[PDB]
Amino acid sequence: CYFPLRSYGFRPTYGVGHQPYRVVVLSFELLHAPATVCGPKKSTNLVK
Amino acid sequence: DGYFKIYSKHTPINLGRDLPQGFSALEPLVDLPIGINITRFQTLLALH
Numbered sequence: 001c002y003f004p005l006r007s008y009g010f011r012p013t014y015g016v017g018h019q020p021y022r023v024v025v026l027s028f029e030l031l032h033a034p035a036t037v038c039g040p041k042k043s044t045n046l047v048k
Numbered sequence: 049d050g051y052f053k054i055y056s057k058h059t060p061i062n063l064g065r066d067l068p069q070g071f072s073a074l075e076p077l078v079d080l081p082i083g084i085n086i087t088r089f090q091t092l093l094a095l096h
């Protein structure tokens with residue numbers, strides 16, 4: 001029995017699938033109230 | 049519709065009377081997508 005399980009032996013030259021790969025995740029389900037992130041929406045030159 | 053809209057005007061007073069005679073319309077200052085529910089309000093005074 002243990003509470004944790006040990007943090008990994010992160011040795012570089014051994015680590016192949018076993019080295020630390022930092023990861024990030026985006027979630028954006030909408031279905032709520034206002035607008036908050038609405039893309040770059042670029043602008044073309046003004047013709048006259 | 050989720051938004052809270054502030055309109056305002058700052059008019060000079062000849063020191064004549066309250067809410068002087070004349071006309072002046074309030075411009076929209078901020079137009080804020082707060083998104084919540086309002087049913088009551090109150091004001092802050094400062095004390096030194």
Ligand SMILES: *[C@@H]1O[C@H](CO)[C@@H](O[C@@H]2O[C@H](CO)[C@@H](O)[C@H](O)[C@H]2NC(C)=O)[C@H](O)[C@H]1NC(C)=O
Nearest residue numbers: 032033049050051052082083084085086087088
């Ligand atoms: C803002 O809050 C009030 C108060 O909770 C909501 O009024 C309720 O509305 C529901 C749905 O119609 C009623 O069943 C309750 O009886 C209401 N409560 C009271 C005390 O009146 C109101 O719907 C809310 N507004 C928004 C836009 O969510």
